[PDB]
């Protein structure tokens, strides 16, 4: 619509003008918050340079390439309807272009010879964010909010989302969260009493907020609530606080809930940048959900002791399955909520006839009485590691029981096995009244 027009600064810009083979010798100046915000912008500039640069590299010698004249692909991409790509003209020049699509594919121009797209150009979120963030800068200098920022450092099931849902005034405040799944769950839980108080305006994903800032809706809020703010670059949090025009912001965070990872190759994100600067730090170390054994595990991953209000002591168990095929709804029904680590395993169980299956990642923040966790892939699964955020999440959803069914030995089998062996009297030491 009118969004493509808002990104005109990027349309047909030379690929070279957006590429920066450096961003390692960058020296920031000013207050810590300013440096973090500057650094956040550069992480976006660096992520875009890499995306544009790889598209050009592909043209020079997922990563799809289109022949303009024949309207047929030389290399078919995995995704569809990419929002942008790099164009190679007949003079062999490289320009970034915001793409349009019709019944027959990409709408092209006569002077375009080939067009390259990739997983990174599927969406123009980086450009969208740059556009928004750069308009807030006066000569590269971002404005820092005078609002008080309170950080609530918590653990699984301590009440991060519950507190937000309990304290927010849906008519004046804003709740920002990373990921659509989380945003949808928050709205659903907020609207569960029967009335819709949580909408697309007072509950938004971080990406949507950054990308569509100004496009309308509403911009000024009295208080800002961020659920899982430690999943974001510190400079991003600084921008969100300022952009919400709030007088106070509550950043609910969790150091083990998939913390913000640089990801950008050779991009600098020093330890002093990774630490959020707030006016007050609050701590939550009592889980109101997890059993005492899962709590023992949590104590191992968090600074500070973790206590539990729950009376449940031991709740985990597992089972090694010989024949992956034996795991079917008739042979062995799976109690409660059925979860898997990968999509492939998820599809498998669904085709086998199991009802309502989701991946661990798809149920972040959710609670269940009983969980049946399943691994059908005997091949290596990277996200299943002793210190993996997915494992942490996978062990902290249930209030009553968790059973892990796997076709192969892995770090999770060890964790569950060790938890089953610990003394129950030791486990009692985590108990608190509440």
């Amino acid at each position: 619509s009118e969004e493509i027009e808002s990104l005109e600064q990027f349309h047909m810009a030379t690929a070279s003008s957006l590429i920066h083979k450096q961003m390692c010798s960058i020296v920031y100046t000013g207050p810590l918050k300013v440096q973090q915000m500057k650094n956040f912008i550069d992480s976006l500039v660096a992520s875009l340079s890499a995306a544009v640069s790889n598209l050009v590299k592909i043209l020079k010698d997922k990563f799809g390439v289109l022949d303009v004249a024949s309207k047929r692909w030389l290399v078919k991409p995995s995704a569809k309807n990419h929002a942008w790509g790099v164009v190679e003209t007949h003079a062999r020049k490289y320009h970034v272009a915001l793409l349009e699509h019709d019944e027959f594919g990409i709408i092209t121009c006569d002077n375009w010879r080939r067009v390259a797209v990739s997983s990174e150009s599927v969406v123009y979120s980086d450009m969208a964010k740059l556009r928004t963030l750069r308009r807030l800068l006066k000569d590269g200098e971002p404005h820092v909010s005078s609002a008080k920022v309170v950080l609530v450092d918590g653990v699984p099931g301590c009440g991060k989302t519950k507190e937000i849902l309990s304290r927010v005034n849906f008519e004046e405040d804003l709740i920002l969260v990373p990921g659509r799944q989380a945003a949808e769950m928050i709205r659903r839980r907020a609207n569960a009493s029967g009335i819709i108080v949580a909408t697309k305006d007072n509950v938004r994903t971080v990406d949507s907020f950054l990308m569509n800032y100004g496009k309308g809706a509403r911009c000024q809020f009295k208080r800002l609530f961020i659920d899982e703010g430690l999943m974001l670059h510190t400079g991003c949090v600084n921008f969100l606080v300022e952009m919400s025009l709030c007088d106070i912001a509550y950043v609910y965070g969790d150091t083990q809930q998939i913390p913000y990872i640089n990801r950008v190759t050779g991009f600098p994100y020093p330890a002093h940048f990774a630490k959020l600067e707030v006016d007050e730090v609050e701590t939550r170390r009592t889980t109101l959900r997890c059993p005492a054994d899962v709590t023992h595990f949590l104590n191992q991953r968090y600074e500070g002791h973790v206590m539990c209000t729950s009376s449940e002591k031991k709740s985990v168990s597992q089972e090694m399955v010989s024949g992956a095929a034996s795991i079917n709804p008739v042979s062995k029904p799976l109690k409660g909520k059925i979860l898997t680590f990968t999509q492939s395993d998820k599809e498998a169980l669904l085709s086998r006839g199991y009802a309502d299956v989701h991946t661990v990642h798809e149920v972040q923040g959710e609670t269940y009485a009983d969980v049946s966790l399943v691994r059908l892939t005997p091949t290596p699964v990277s996200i299943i590691a002793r210190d993996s955020p997915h494992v942490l999440v996978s062990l902290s959803r249930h209030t009553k029981s968790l059973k892990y069914y796997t076709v192969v030995m892995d770090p999770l089998v060890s964790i569950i096995r060790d938890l089953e062996r610990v003394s129950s009297y030791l486990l009692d030491m985590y108990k608190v009244d509440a």
Binding site: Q300, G304, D418, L419, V422, Y425, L426, M429
Partner: protein, 415 residues
């Protein structure tokens, strides 16, 4: 009525624990044939699994659950851990420490002995070294041969090598366990049937000062204990201070402070000096070897320091010269502690140099740093009524500086 405790994880080493206890009881009775006070033996289970042990032959016995129930989770175990067993052992270790602390108060603790692999040794060591020096502390360990500092620390904890992994009573363990138990009983019975000391910190580069001071002190009628300032030395001295073994300190070499600030291999912890000030014992402090941070070998030297002035003392160790900015930091740490003093303290500073390497015509010589250290110290302590700052016209190794340090000690601790 003297009592000793035999401790171990009964869920995995029940028979060995029993055997040891049995041998300790028998040995205690034999060796004390001279008789008198009877020594009681209590067996303590520190198992952390759910497997329960309710007795150990005919011994007074404390189950795993009773050790834990006397304890409340504390700061010692609030950090992060590698696995479930590691955290369980850490909590049990502190619970054991509490149990022994109560035993040592409302009971006559005569000694403690235990056995274990790396995990059991880790569990027992921590609790055992919390007891006063002198009280027999013995552990038959499968890891007595290797790095033992994390187990023994500055204590008198004794690790008897198990020779073979601890697994059942066999011809080998019978002998090893028997000797260890007989040794413990010997220590216990021998202990039952039966001068003002100054602590001084030292380094090779400040030995001239230390020996002069030591000789002077002995002449004044004092007894001395010299500690190599390798990080552990400073702590060893301070633990002895709170232990009542040291009545005065001449902290000549505070170099451990440098490694703590910069990040060397022979660093002190953030608690340096605390023990001395809290005991309110006379303290004369100086800046010996504060011109060098320890590393070695060169290759080891953190990247950001290879551009610094290094001195290869030998193959395994290299000394880095401290800059002028780092010294001010040293002063801040020292002063920050000294400004908490509630008893007399004297700081003696040598104008000429702080080490044999920080002397006219020497590698580390830098009067710009020496001068800075002096000024920062005077200024930070200027408003401390309990502290006097003396700036003497000598090099730390001059015989007159040594004798000046002693004079200062005598005036805050007259005789």
């Amino acid at each position: 009525s003297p009592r000793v405790f035999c401790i171990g994880t009964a869920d995995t080493k029940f028979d060995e624990l029993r055997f040891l206890s049995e041998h300790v009881r028998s040995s205690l009775n034999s060796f004390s044939n001279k008789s008198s006070f009877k020594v009681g033996v209590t067996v303590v289970d520190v198992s952390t699994s759910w497997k329960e042990t309710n007795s150990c032959a005919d011994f007074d016995f404390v189950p795993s659950k009773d050790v834990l129930s006397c304890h409340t989770l504390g700061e010692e175990t609030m950090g992060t851990f590698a696995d479930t067993r590691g955290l369980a052992i850490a909590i049990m270790s502190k619970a054991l420490e509490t149990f022994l602390s109560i035993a040592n108060d409302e009971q006559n603790l005569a000694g403690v002995i235990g056995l274990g692999g790396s995990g059991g040794t880790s569990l027992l060591s921590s609790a055992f070294r919390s007891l006063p020096i002198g009280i027999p502390k013995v552990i038959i360990s499968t890891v007595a041969s290797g790095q033992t500092e994390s187990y023994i620390g500055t204590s008198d904890l004794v690790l008897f090598p198990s020779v073979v992994d601890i697994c059942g009573i066999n011809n080998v363990s019978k002998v090893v366990l028997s000797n260890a138990g007989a040794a413990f009983a010997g220590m216990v019975i021998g202990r039952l049937e039966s001068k003002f000391t100054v602590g001084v910190t030292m380094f090779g580069v400040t030995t001239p000062c230390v020996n002069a001071v030591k000789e002077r002190l002995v002449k004044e009628g004092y007894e001395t204990l010299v500690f190599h300032a390798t990080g552990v030395g400073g702590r060893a001295m301070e633990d002895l201070v709170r232990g009542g073994f040291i009545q005065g300190v001449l902290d000549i070499t505070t170099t451990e402070v440098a490694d703590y600030v910069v990040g060397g291999v022979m660093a002190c912890d953030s608690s340096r000096f605390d023990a001395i000030l809290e005991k309110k014992i006379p303290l004369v402090l100086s800046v010996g070897a504060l011109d060098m941070v320890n590393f070695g070998p060169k290759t080891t030297i953190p990247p950001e320091f290879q551009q610094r002035k290094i001195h290869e003392h030998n193959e395994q160790v290299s000394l880095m010269r401290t800059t002028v900015g780092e010294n001010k930091k040293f002063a801040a740490f020292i002063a920050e502690k000294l400004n908490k003093a509630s008893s007399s303290v004297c700081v003696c500073l040598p104008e000429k140099g702080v080490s044999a390497l920080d002397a006219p015509g020497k590698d580390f010589y830098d009067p710009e740093a020496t001068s800075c250290l002096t000024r920062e110290l005077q200024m930070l302590l200027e408003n401390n009524e309990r502290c006097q700052v003396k700036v003497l016209p000598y090099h730390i190794n001059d015989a007159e500086f040594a004798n000046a340090l002693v004079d200062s000690f005598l005036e805050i601790s007259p005789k």
